[model samples]
Target chain A: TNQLQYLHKVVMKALWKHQFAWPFRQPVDAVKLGLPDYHKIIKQPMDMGTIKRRLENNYYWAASECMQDFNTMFTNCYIYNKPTDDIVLMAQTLEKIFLQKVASMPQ
Target chain B: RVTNQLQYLHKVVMKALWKHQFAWPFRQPVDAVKLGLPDYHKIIKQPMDMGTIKRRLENNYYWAASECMQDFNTMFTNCYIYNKPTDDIVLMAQTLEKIFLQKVASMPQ
Candidate 1:
């Protein structure tokens, strides 16, 4: 009963498909974005693709941990970019929805 | 040039509206409790919004583009029923509907 993956599967799948999630479906490209210090400031870089793989590989013991990574992914962008930037807005929009759905996740 | 193509135009039109500022109020289904409107659900029988519409379009929920617009119409109509015509949200609904139809009219028929 320790592994609660079904909850994450449903939630992550929705995040995977949400339009606001377009920018966060993969790991951030620090080189392309011209932020070479992304890794330095944010040690734990996570993303939907990696989160999905973790879920598939049973890397997360609970949905909360998986959800944390999703939030971490969004927050990383916030740290690397200006808050008013379009990318930040996209992350805020998606993260808002993600939090709403997760509120009802199984305990 | 005959523009009679109708296969995938529905999504193209819908995806465009999701980013509109006016459309934000109607982006997701209204939260009656959060807004403190107890009768929103009771009054509006068929609730619709851009966010839900987007997912539906992605999943092929609409049989035709017209069907898609029909739901948009419901969203606007619902707002109109619940709010005065002068309300900002109502005005936004009006504006968004205009933009929606304009997009549809220009689509290669």
Candidate 2:
């Protein structure tokens, strides 16, 4: 249970960090950021309606489910936990968002 | 012209993120009519400008890049590149050179 709680914390941390600094406005914005498939990745597990609704309320439950889905997809669909070069590039770009969030957080 | 378009794209992305972060999802009494919720004066309202949004995005990116320069260097180093320079690379280089020359021409003595 403790391990699961730790995983949840880590996932929520990363997820919120991503949300707070999201950089894409549209598919073209993602393309400019060098992640042409960014929209697809975001919409794969859940659609925008669900995302917005969950976010409007507290996002804990929805974010946990999304992170779990990401883990499964990353492991199985993306080949045994080995991310492709594009995925690595996307992760790097997303890391910028996470870093920005950390820097902006109140002291 | 291309540089202008690039700036415009940056502004669009920045504004989109700003709106998503600040304005969306949450319901307010003013928004209650539209959202079908009871009127309540609970939601916070803040106004911002395009210049402020652009400046904030620029500052955030600048600070993040400066702080994580080493990580950025490593990431760039690991990126895949063709053994031979491609046409796109050549074009990009040429474009950057032109931009640099223009800047140099405009520099104050």
Candidate 3:
């Protein structure tokens, strides 16, 4: 999984650079490079979509768990299991970066 | 200020994501509609004039703030490359929104 993560990061890094190059052209050509190149970087997963879905789903779970920890850290003072402001901000920051990444892909 | 800024920036980013997700080829007319751009907003629309585009770029540089310029750059890049099924903008949007919700829920008081 760590190796897979490293490979995914590499593809994401390439995709990010490609997106930066065009910066709002249309039809995201950068991702085309990713499609072919990703197979080269990472061993083909059993199912890419399922794998992606699971990873995202796991992140959601981790977020929830983190929130629980945050609440407990506060001595159960708050009923809600919300995360720290930093983690929350980090999540949002990551999302913007990811969107920027996706949007920049060549059409 | 931070919350407001984040919220506003996030909305704009989401809007771009939505625009890219729904429109195909993102033709000028369709792109305008998706972006909620005003009527009569053309600098050649499609097959745009490089001169007019250069002027517009200058105008943005002159009038828009630095952060806005950065945001516009990001939006432009995304639209150019990922604004189609091949790039999978739809899946991207859905994933983004879910992640956003999780992030918001995690926000501290």
Q: What TM-score, over all chains together, does every model reach?
A: 0.46, 0.22, 0.21
Model 1 misplaced regions, further than 4 Å: A1-3, B1-109
Error of 1 at B93 (Å): 38
Candidate 3 chain A: 10-residue stretch with minimal lDDT: A72-81
Q: Per the 3 Å backbone cut-off, how many clashing residue pairs does candidate 1 have?
A: 2
Error of 3 at A100 (Å): 2.4
User: Model 3 off-target regions past 4 Å?
Assistant: A1-84, B1-109
Report how far residue B92 has shifted in candidate 2, in Å.
Answer: 42
Error of 1 at B47 (Å): 31
Clashing pairs in 1: B3-B109, B4-B109
Docking class of 2: incorrect
Tens digits of per-residue lDDT, candidate 1, A1-107, equal: 22246445666777778877877888878899788877776677888889888877878765546655665676566555643468756775676555445433444
lDDT (tens digit, per residue) of candidate 2 on B9-80: 244433343344333221121244564644222321222233443454455534332233223222222211
Model 2 spans > 4 angstroms off: A1-52, A61-83, B1-109
DockQ of 1: 0.01
Local error of candidate 3 at A27, Å?
A: 31
Q: Pick the candidate with the highest TM-score.
A: 1
What is the model-wide C-alpha lDDT for candidate 1? Answer: 0.64
